[PDB]
Amino acid sequence: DMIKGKQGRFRQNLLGKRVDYSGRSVITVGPYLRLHQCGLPKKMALELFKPFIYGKLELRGLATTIKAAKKMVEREEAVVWDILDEVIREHPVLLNRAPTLHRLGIQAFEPVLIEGKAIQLHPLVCAAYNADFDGDQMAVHVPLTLEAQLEARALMMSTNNILSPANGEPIIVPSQDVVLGLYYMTRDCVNAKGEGMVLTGPKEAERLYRSGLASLHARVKVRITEYEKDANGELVAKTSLKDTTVGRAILWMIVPKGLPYSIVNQALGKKAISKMLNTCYRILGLKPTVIFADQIMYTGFAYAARSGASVGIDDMVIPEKKHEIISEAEAEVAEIQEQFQSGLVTAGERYNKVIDIWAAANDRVSKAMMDNLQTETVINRDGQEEKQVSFNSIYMMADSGARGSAAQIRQLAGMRGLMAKPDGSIIETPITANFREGLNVLQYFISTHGARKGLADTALKTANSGYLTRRLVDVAQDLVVTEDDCGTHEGIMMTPVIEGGDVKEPLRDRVLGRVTAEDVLKPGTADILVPRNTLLHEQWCDLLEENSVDAVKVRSVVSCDTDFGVCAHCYGRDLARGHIINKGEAIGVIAAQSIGEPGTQLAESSIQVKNKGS
Amino acid sequence: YSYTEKKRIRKDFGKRPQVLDVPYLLSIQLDSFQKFIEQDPEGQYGLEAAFRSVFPIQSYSGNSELQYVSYRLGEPVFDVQECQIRGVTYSAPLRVKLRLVIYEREAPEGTVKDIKEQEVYMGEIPLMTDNGTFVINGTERVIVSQLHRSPGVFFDSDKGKTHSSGKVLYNARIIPYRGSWLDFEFDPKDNLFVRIDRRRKLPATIILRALNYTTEQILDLFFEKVIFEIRDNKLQMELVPERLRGETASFDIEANGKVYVEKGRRITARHIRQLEKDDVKLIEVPVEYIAGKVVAKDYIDESTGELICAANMELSLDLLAKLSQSGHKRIETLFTNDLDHGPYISETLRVDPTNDRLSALVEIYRMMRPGEPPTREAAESLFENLFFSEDRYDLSAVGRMKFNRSLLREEIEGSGILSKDDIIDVMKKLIDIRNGKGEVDDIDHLGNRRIRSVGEMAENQFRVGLVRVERAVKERLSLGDLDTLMPQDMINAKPISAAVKEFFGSSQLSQFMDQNNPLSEITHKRRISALGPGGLTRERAGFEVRDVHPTHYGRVCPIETPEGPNIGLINSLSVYAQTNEYGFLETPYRKVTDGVVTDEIHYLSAIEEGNYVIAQANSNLDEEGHFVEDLVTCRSKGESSLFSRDQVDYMDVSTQQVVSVGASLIPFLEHDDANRALMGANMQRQAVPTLRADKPLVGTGMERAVAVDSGVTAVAKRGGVVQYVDASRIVIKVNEDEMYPGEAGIDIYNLTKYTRSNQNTCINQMPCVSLGEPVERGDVLADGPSTDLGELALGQNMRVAFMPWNGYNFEDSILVSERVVQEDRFTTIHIQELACVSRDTKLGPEEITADIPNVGEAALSKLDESGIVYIGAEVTGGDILVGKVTPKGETQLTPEEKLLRAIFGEKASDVKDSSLRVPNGVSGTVIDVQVFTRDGVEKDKRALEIEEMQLKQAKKDLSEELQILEAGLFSRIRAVLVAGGVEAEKLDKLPRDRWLELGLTDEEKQNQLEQLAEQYDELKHEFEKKLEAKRRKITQGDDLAPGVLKIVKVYLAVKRRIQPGDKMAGRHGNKGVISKINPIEDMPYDENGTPVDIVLNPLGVPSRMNIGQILETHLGMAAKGIGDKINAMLKQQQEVAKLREFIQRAYDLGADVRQKVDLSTFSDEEVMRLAENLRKGMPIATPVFDGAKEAEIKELLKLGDLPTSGQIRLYDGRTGEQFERPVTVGYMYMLKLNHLVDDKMHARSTGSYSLVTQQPLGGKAQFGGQRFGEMEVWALEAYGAAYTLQEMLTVKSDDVNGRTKMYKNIVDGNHQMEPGMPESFNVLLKEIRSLGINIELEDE
């Protein structure tokens, strides 16, 4: 029993040790921080770095011996705090959050001494940690040796890990407040103060906004000088007059040179911001992307605060024609039930009919609510009136992609649809009321059942996930990249998976960053498009898009020739960095983590061709 | 209204009139324990039942019977409060009357001797307090009720997972209250198998064999016969027409001269009707048809005797021929319809190896006791005691009721033991349902789940103690001599008290009271746990068990249950529910007389509820119980639909009866999603009492019920007038009505000040009333923790504004203004207890003296001569809490050295200190000290002060009562002295004590003066003896454990202020961590200049669909607006008239309201007082489902002269510029939860390491490091981080030389390392080598 088992050994004391120089505390927002830093309470920092303090105190000669250094720390004089500030300067610390699902559960930050007993965590990384500020705690370790310092700053630093190891897409995307602020900033209105005046640049736009002589969103013609690296790395300024809003210019102040103005010209929602970050990374590189993200955060918070967006009870308007629709559907259900009591239709048929008519009524009310709420701002220009995409705060929260989906909008202001009984069968009468109104005992009771089942599901799902990912990481641990290139020509012929109706996933994304098994020819023979095995980066993928290559044989890890591991070429590039895989990287563990962590949310008569083809 | 109610009335919205008032909330515990003790004649539930169950105890044929008469509960030696103070269990001695009777050894039976024992003492039984809890060692414990499967028989399906080929195999399980389990299951081959509790599955018929039934009897009892007659030729069969249902014809079915079914045509419905109307009984049949059947009985050759065919043998031509020639006209075959009627007992008999009774008993014995040769009587006794012994196997009265109901018998009362007819009917019902003429039971039905409360479990455990002691006494009375011993050497109290204290103390369901909130206590006491003994484990339990059954309606709360891993297994009980006579759950409903909705209420259980059509509570009734709508919405068999007015049988009592108390406390529940209500309630039960609780601006009205029913408030028992008010006691003069005629006196209530609760919170009571105020029975005298004037005030109500403020409320985090900490409104007091124990070692007892080796006089400065801290001293971490010395032995000093010691004064006995020190990093004030001395030659100095402090108070109380009685006696002495010669001039000016020595003319009057003098003496002498007794009880040593000389307890109290990192929450499931304290100037302010208190993120609303907070904010803004208006009108003091007009127009506010308030109070004073209490804002009461609609909120906002839309224009406190689009502001009632950052925060650099594996200690008391688990290792491996992981693995934890070398190297300002091999690996090597395995570290 002592050897075997969890409590006994290997798991507990030989894979699950208890390190020194470690702490734990509650996490907090701290918006003013830079992306690459973290707020650390004074007293814990002093306790951790005690021996460093003693060493430096003795080096400076302020204390003759170690006991005098201890006494000097226990008095806590100004000199001690100055030495602590000086030693902490470039020393990085490791932050960890209890369920380390993937490799982003441990990251390094530079600490900044602060008052208080709470750790301050940079907002952008919360998504990576799956961290929430509701009493979650985090542990903090200190790397001691020089190699540890170099490792923390090089491999683990926040700015070096912007791409998820699972897929190439960015992890640090703005979450909720930032996107709301930016959305508020970029949306335009038909008529406001300062409509159509011409500004020489963003600086006087800000002059106007801060002085209250012009609205933050108002259509205007501005002269702007964008830069484009179209030549072989030279930037060419093109300067012209565009018709935009004040807000988009204000945002434009931050934006680095390389990006087209068009990027900001639109509504700038969640998707738009994500692809903005993507383009900024692909064109300029890492450092501009980091600084641009920080600027975006700061400006979003500031102008979100200036907006003053709130939520009152009258902000969610019950559609006027709900009651009619419901009474009509009730009359229809009554007619179908009476026509059942005479016995011309089975019970199941009546069941199906009622469920379908109720679904139709739900769709009707939903569409009526969206029509009512969406475009209701009938504000007036000089003379006659006009209508435009409303500025209703709940509507902006829906449309921006900041919080909520159409389903939740329905759940707030419409009827909250059908429910499932324990066995999965659907109750005949739905919940016609919404949270703005009041439910009654039955409808509540039903929804209570729903929520209970949901919660229990999440619990068991988490347990099963954890277990599965543990097995996965266990099996694939020993696989290592041992050789540079095995030199095989073999590979798997990869096509775009066209499941039924259309192209669920295109080729270009499917092939990006894979080396080719053999040269592919244009649709006309002897027109080699790609030499023997080349790593397919974005430029090659776009080149393939310009042509009409359909299927590409690419070297796969399974067919790799290397003994006892894999070679760089057979694997490919994809990483948090962009380049070909480096020899030595443990791809087994990264693969297992990447597969495990997301695992917590888990008639036919005629064919009809959709597009004109052979 | 009552007086405390007249003090501050709460404006109640709500349209429907409350017909039933909330019952006593603690009914369960009190009623159950009352039923448990309950000295009663007729043996019902109660100790009496146990005694009669176990008694009479007869010797092993020794003819010495022992009889039981009755028992008596001794008077507790220690009252509740003093028992808690002194750290002993509050209990009563149990005394039982017994008789020993000895007969004549060799004569007709007749009592030779009967001796009656003088109420022998058989141990102590703990008593329950007034509130329904138990003090077990000076700690308050709660015994949670347990939900479990009721005894009886259940028929389950268990399909899907049966070999994954369908084959739904049914099973009947018989579970008794006391005894082994019985199980009947099927098999793919339709053989019905029995499996003793948890063994292999045998053929069922064996049990029928054990019951003494022969094969022919069984085949008679179970299968339906089929008759083949031979009349004049060829095999004619007696046929019941209705049997032909569904059968393709295999032969030509001719009958009575006419072919009916042609050979080959399947019998059609036309043919079936023809044959039925024709009344065909017998039909001739071809011999091929019979050439396949099976024989029922064992047909022997009656003439010669030789057997031919056996019972249940397949027929062959030779057997048919022998039968036909033997002369057998009537053949009985079996009916095996492979579709409906199967050969089940037949096939079981084929697999059944046993034939005779003896072989069956042998097989049973070889199942129960494998390996020992079975002897007949051993098997007989084993089998008898297994399932049919009254003592071992008992179902219940309830078990029997369920058993008879399952087999559809009208009779409820049966015999406990399992009779054979029972088993046969059970197997019949099982095979019947297997055919499909019956329904399976649902485990989740509350009709199948019974509640075992405290008294029942205590009774069971006590019975177990009795069976132990009975076997023991049995043996002792058998072996030992009969007539020598008296009935007290024979009975030992040790096992009874041992079993009872084991159950009460170390059990899963007996747990510490969750004592930080009144709500926490009250909800903890009314809990129903499915864990504990005979309960499912959480991991094993299926999702189906943890679902909410439609039966829970109005009995258990669907929404209040911990959201942790054991979600769904707790299910706090609803408000109005009660326990049945049998321990089931029943809920009230109002009767419906065909048209009128009457007022008589009936309590219905689950099954009874299932049948009827019950109307909803929120149905509109006008003045006579008539429905406004013609078709109303009801539920009849667990499904809702529309019924006509004159169809409803019952109607819900009130909207609240579905939900528990916790959910009923949340306002605007109707607008909150069930999930967020769940989390809100679960968290809200963790709130900590603040310094001065005030009240919720938005409540539900249930607050007074909860506060009163919990025992935290002080409530008047007999109404009277407040005589004396102090912040320690309230003294009341009783009213003459309730005043006892003989020896009444007055009532005195001593309050309890700051003591430590289980959760380390403060428990302080404040007086409400003032001198000379009249109080009535049931008013709130003193406020308990976090309650005001009778109302629950869990937290405090502050002005919130919903807006994002420079991303400081980014996520659920919360921003708070420095004004909140300045005003000191979220600061809580906590309380740690510390204990120093001085035991007796064999090298010598340790000492408490102040002479402590090599300590500076700084440490002694704060200690008195006795060695105890001064009361009121401020201490810090590391200071010596108390002084103790460890004895030192075998010093063997040289004589010159001894002389030196003598002159210097050095003590050989000491040289070591065991003195307790304040834990690291905790600093507070010593508020209290207690001393417990097991042996002590005399009371210690400190003991004397503490005894006098308690004593003087007790003395004061007795003196006060005595002084009142003396004043009365003196008044009466003056009234007698006035008779017999009036003397009022001289008397009143001479002292009162000079009235007994005075005289009067010799008459009966002199006799009366002597009477009153003797009464004066008697009152003095009774006072003195009661006082002496009380002082002897106080002084005596409180019995401590063996080996401990004495104990000193010290209480520290610490004031913790709110700071960044603490967790704060609302009532609707919104959470957050306080992120920053802003200066007053930065906070937003309205035009008027009032700043907001909390700035809360709006984005928490849409995805977390809790809309209750928005309505709460609006209504709270309305209430504070009215309160502001009343404060403004009151500061100028216009006149009573204006105030009355304004308050009346406010209190009315429309119509249809059940309020009826104002204008009955004294025209000026009581109105002025009520205005003073409401000037801070008028408290509202929105009930759960009969709540305030939007229009009413709009009206209330208008009455205050505020925007009806609930949004205001706001100015940015930092910049001064206006915010676009006005924002929602208003007051919300928020709570501070028990998760305080200073308790959570923790760090270590280097410290103590563990003994065996030289890793740093685990824990918080000792510094302790974080656990770098395998997942983190994997995380590091995903990176190329080899050196960090290496140092983390060896230098940081496990390498001893490595850690010291690294410490020195770091100190030197160099950063390298020397990894070495971890010590734990060496431990692993040593442990593997301890087996027979040689594992060596090779080298080359």
Ligand SMILES: [Mg+2]
């Ligand atoms: Mg959290």
Ligand SMILES: [Zn+2]
């Ligand atoms: Zn390869």
